[PDB]
Symmetry: D3
Subunit: 236 residues, 6 copies
């Protein structure tokens, strides 16, 4: 079993999170999972949709037409967001809201925008891992503006994928591996080691209990390195 | 812990699958998970999208405007299918294709249409469980027409949900339970006991390993009753 | 002249109206005109569009993808309602509003949803005939809730079609007859024997006065059986 | 009973048909029904949609934003054609195809475009009456080009409306009358005096048999003047 | 160098502006630049979009399907306005607003609708030149209604094009010339001889300074005749 | 007159062009005009739209939701590209095609994608200036693949804007200046000093001849520095 990148089965790709990446957002990060590069921004808006309950957070995902090996059609000109985009967006939104105590956010709405500049697998996991850092920077801004009702950060959140490649569970899939793997798992967890999201899919041979547990265990292991990178970035 | 329906935590709702429900489809079933009633039809078409590889199977999901407690906007007049619909459709399509050896299906395309007539939770799981029966009836039709290349049925597939209600994992959620539960799990498995799909989401307290395993174990248990019902229906 | 179904020229198909068909709507009926099966629900909403004048009633029509012999494209995924759908919807809305004294309905809006589960001609006429029964059940609900300003039911309404098949006017067309007939008539009438809608179209030989009168007379005749069925259903 | 225009109940508005109105179309007419002014063009195209059977004819309807008393939203910017437009378009298409022996049209497709420059009721009837003249001019062009298979003109077609105003059936409704009338009738007939289309609708008191016959008789009467105007225009 | 129309390089096409063309608009003009015929209407509406600052003016452009040599698809049925339409609309809106002191217009919104009945080049320039006359008629109406805050007419505005045909700058391009020319210029100026819009584009040989100045000088020259025609029309 | 950035009236912002920016495109550049940062990629595709004549080149423009001071709605979710986007896209496409001898490009189609990562005025001019460099890199790739018919590069192309700020013509506008200026000019020129595009617009006081010439002269002056930067980047 030899991964295309020469990486070991339990080895993450080189990762880097850069804060204050673009100048307008209350929070802006360039997150890099190897060749996967995504810009995640957080935009604070006054008011809320239809609540009286707490604040709100919603997310959107986008890809540059040639962030991919083969050009992908611009959803703007096709006049419609595909199933994949909607799936990834919802995931991001759920994941980030799970990290917040919306009642302490105030009557504000946070807009998360994750745009893939260069894709090579795991854009959704990189997006969540990086968006969390951007989110924290944004909360510091709103706190400064005295627009919050306490510290809404419940707990850090990160994500990573796992897939069966050459019959072996490998961590943090790149495009080639994801294209070849018929069985994969996307996981979103917190600092406390709690799962907020687990999604496993099998196109051919169904994955059995031990198999799933094996993938789950590999993901948790690598999750620790991600939280570390997030903290390091926030302390830099 | 008392479920709204008075059902035990490990008890499925009354279930029934009726074949040859509507007269035009090559396969048509009315599947009932308690008050959740869905019509699942299979439409065989000659030819395939863009392949040379095998046949194909794709699925669509729909709900009647008042199949729900509160009227839901007709996607046709809104001129767009929402995120939920796209999510459910993709799941159904993946699940049913997993049940087939597309290479033995021939140069044909199977259209799966799952429409909710009355909803009360678990429309996607009922849809998959019932669609499989409809799919088998459809394969018998194509076989008769001598349009297949062997028996494409790899293995039966069924689905069920599980959620944390009143701090307890309960099987086959109705609308009230799903509305209250912040942690749930949707699972799609096969006869051999293999998973083809596992999706767990937590909006509040993240679910821990044992918790997930507990939900997974409850789902598998109830999955056996579903395969039984499917066989009984096909032998009737 | 032998109709495909073996039915006489002045014979309606077997008809049945089932009330309280699905559990959420204020009114819900399964109406059956032979093999044509439509679910008609009525959804009461507080308030009105842009009036100060009276209540309101609007209708929508839909078909399951395989409610037809040949699969029809789901308007939701095509992202647009076709001409036929809009035509049928408007007809239903006009027909049902004609049955009401909107000034006695109160500041409420009634949503009529007619979805074809199985089609075999006359879906629009079955829809109107059945929707009226559902509408009455809904009015009883609003009356109970003390949300009305008197009894808004002006008069019962029903509908039926007529077409020239094999050179002979035949009543209540099925799909085969409608497909073959180049001259047809759709009629919507009331208890008092008044017309609220008359639509005759000829694709080939134009229909002459006597011809139209003949079709009109045949429709009125069969209309009496429909009002009878509606009353019987409401008294059951 | 005094009509707004001072016109008698059986009196048509001043009518005029001008051929070769705009220079690009194979047929182009400005038809005027009083203050209702519509430009009807016919565009000949080589080939056909999906036939092997005959030629084809399809129609489209449009209104200038201020062809109406109150500005109406441009369907182009709303990105959608309303129910009214689709209804009128289909009617026009059916009406004009009824006038043709499509088998003698050849493998060609005729595009009918009816655009209202100034509206004051009866735009659809004026459209049909004028489009027929444009259609004939277009057929002469294709005949000259030797693109036809004989003379496809089966018979002239014209249209007019009738409505109950002040309790009296009046011929050729203007906007004010149509706005006030709760009962109206649109009719499309041929030279031979045959009906190709009859549509009567009642919003309040249903119209009875004699009433309908009365409206029908008034329409036929005025139809003769229209065929006369069409012939006069074609002989000019 | 011989222009298709036999016109000299510095000669405008025959031009005519007819006011009060259609009866509903507060301002309505038929403007004719040779075979290019456009109807320009102005619709006054009470209130404004999102301002507190002044009134507003916005414009829309449309073409009849066969106003062109070859039928152009109706944007209404395509459900979208093309790039060309949006470009022309914005230009018209900017041009006409430049002619107004919006602060003296009051809390009103003017809707400009320019629809091409017959096209032969320069529809956008004819549109602006004619819309200005319609705009003035509309202002007189609002003034009469005492809905204005003074005279908002800052200065008359007109437009014309210039292009390199056969290596020579020619004024007011028709369709054939515009189709052949790789270098053209559209200009919008005022009475005082000031430019509000200048747009030059070269598809092949880039145009040099002197070349541009030459085109600019030719346009200004012909602009005087246009202002003359506008005044003559308003004094008629 | 003091520009917000402290820049002189004839001083360009700091500019930088980085080639091979993202790894998938045949050409990819990050172009920076001060705080305006745009990624321009070129995607080579085999074949052409509807030609037999030469190759083709088309362009698309996009902005990240928070590439702007205030979040701008994602066109993908709005399901439509605004007027501004279409305008900029067309400009880019025209500009880049002007730089090519499409007959020497072969039966290929070049897709230009310009996405704004951070905006601060002049995104369209930066886009064109940078896209040209990306285009050249892409041509070298196709030449290597032996897919071209000679060297299609006719001449380098660059662009810059000019506007009246504080009554003075200033070069290369940032967002603040563009927001304040009522008179601006966008220009696209070639190496030979030829204009391929000139667009001047005035919202208030119309710009006179000398004024336009002054802006034009300032633009040409700064254009030389841009061609220099492009060459330097290609020789690096």
């Amino acid at each position: 079993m030899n991964r295309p990148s020469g990486r070991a089965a339990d080895q993450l790709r080189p990762i880097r999170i850069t804060r204050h990446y673009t100048k307008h957002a209350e929070g802006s990060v360039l997150v890099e999972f190897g060749d996967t590069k995504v810009i995640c921004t957080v935009s604070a808006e006054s008011g809320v949709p239809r609540f009286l309950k707490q604040g709100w957070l919603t997310a959107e995902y986008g890809m540059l037409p040639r962030s991919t090996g083969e050009r992908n059609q611009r959803e703007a000109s096709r006049g419609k967001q595909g199933g994949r985009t909607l799936e990834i967006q919802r995931l991001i939104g759920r994941s980030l809201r799970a990290a917040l105590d919306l009642s302490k956010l105030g009557e504000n709405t946070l807009y998360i925008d994750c745009d893939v500049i260069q894709a090579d697998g795991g854009t959704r996991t990189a997006s969540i891992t990086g968006a969390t850092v951007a989110l924290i920077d944004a909360l510091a801004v709103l706190k400064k503006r005295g627009a919050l009702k306490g510290n809404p950060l419940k707990q850090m959140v990160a994500a990573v994928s796992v897939g069966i490649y050459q019959g072996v569970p490998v961590l943090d899939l790149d495009y080639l591996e994801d294209s070849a793997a018929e069985t994969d798992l996307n996981v979103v967890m917190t600092d406390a080691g709690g799962f907020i999201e687990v999604q496993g899919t099998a196109e051919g041979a169904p994955f059995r209990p031990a198999e799933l547990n094996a993938m789950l265990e590999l993901a948790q292991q690598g999750m620790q390195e991600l939280f570390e990178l997030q903290r390091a970035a926030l302390a830099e």
